[PDB]
Design a protein around this ligand. Sequence first.
Ligand SMILES: CCCCCCCC/C=C/CCCCCC(=O)OC[C@H](O)CO
Ligand SMILES: CCCCCCCC/C=C\CCCCCC(=O)OC[C@H](O)CO
Ligand SMILES: CCCCCCCC/C=C\CCCCCC(=O)OC[C@H](O)CO
Ligand SMILES: CCCCCCCC/C=C\CCCCCC(=O)OC[C@H](O)CO
Ligand SMILES: CCCCCCCC/C=C\CCCCCC(=O)OC[C@H](O)CO
Ligand SMILES: CCCCCCCC/C=C\CCCCCC(=O)OC[C@H](O)CO
Length: 200
Amino acid sequence: GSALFLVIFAYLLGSITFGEVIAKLKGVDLRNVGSGNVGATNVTRALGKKYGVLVFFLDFLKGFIPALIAVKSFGIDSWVLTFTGLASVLGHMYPVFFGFKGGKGVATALGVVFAVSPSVALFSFLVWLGIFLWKRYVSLASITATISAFLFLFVAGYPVNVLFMAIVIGALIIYRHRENINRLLTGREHRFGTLEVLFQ
Ligand SMILES: CCCCCCCC/C=C/CCCCCC(=O)OC[C@H](O)CO
Ligand SMILES: CCCCCCCC/C=C\CCCCCC(=O)OC[C@H](O)CO
Ligand SMILES: CCCCCCCC/C=C\CCCCCC(=O)OC[C@H](O)CO
Ligand SMILES: CCCCCCCC/C=C\CCCCCC(=O)OC[C@H](O)CO
Ligand SMILES: CCCCCCCC/C=C\CCCCCC(=O)OC[C@H](O)CO
Ligand SMILES: CCCCCCCC/C=C\CCCCCC(=O)OC[C@H](O)CO
């Protein structure tokens, strides 16, 4: 019973459109700018990195808080954790709040992973940072770091319930990047260059 309530809590906390609450206070509706989605990436597009970092933290806490309750109440080997983390990420991407669409969900997914293993989350972040500084594609770093988190969980000996959670979350994030992949492979993906470092 408490397990079903935690999975529902994870879906509803993960549903919260923090990006939209913060964008509206700055006069912006995120459905009418950039990707049309609510998340740290589209908040960064509309409002810049100061607001982006705040929404990244908040979206991270959407994955972090239910998964930490599941780890502490049920355990790393509980399928309760599996469905709590999946609920947070599907609630972010496809919220109960009809008429909104979540962003690709890297921040929310990272919060889930950090609740399971802070070491895995930091190493996944370091992989992201390495690829980003090398190639200057955001999408390439995110896709590669998402697979890396799965590999680190596998090599570290996390059980099948955790690897199942990681593979499905990973698969959903790669699916949300499908056009980035098509652009990367056809030389159409925008790189993070001097004007992107500087003007905004
Ligand atoms: C490009 C090729 C480079 C070669 C790649 C080899 C990778 C092999 C992994 C070794 C694991 C060593 C121990 C990993 C860290 C570890 O055990 O955890 C730390 C703490 O938990 C947090 O700092
Ligand atoms: C800039 C935005 C990004 C935000 C990123 C940093 C967020 C740090 C939050 C909480 C730390 C509390 C420590 C939690 C410890 C934790 O996860 O413990 C699980 C067990 O280790 C699993 O068994
Ligand atoms: C344990 C490890 C913790 C990890 C700490 C990570 C902190 C990330 C900081 C900012 C995110 C800003 C929001 C993302 C912006 C973004 O992806 O922008 C691409 C767009 O293409 C822009 O046009
Ligand atoms: C299976 C779950 C694993 C999931 C763990 C993810 C890896 C963590 C890496 C970096 C965090 C900072 C990322 C900052 C850039 C960012 O938010 O990028 C958005 C999209 O890639 C834009 O297209
Ligand atoms: C990124 C490559 C994708 C391919 C991975 C290759 C290496 C790791 C293999 C398996 C982990 C399995 C974790 C998922 C377990 C799975 O499918 O769950 C069935 C249930 O356990 C039935 O009860
Ligand atoms: C740790 C992560 C493990 C990952 C496990 C497997 C991941 C692959 C699954 C889905 C990708 C979806 C791709 C859908 C293909 C598709 O619809 O193609 C459209 C074009 O690429 C342009 O729209």
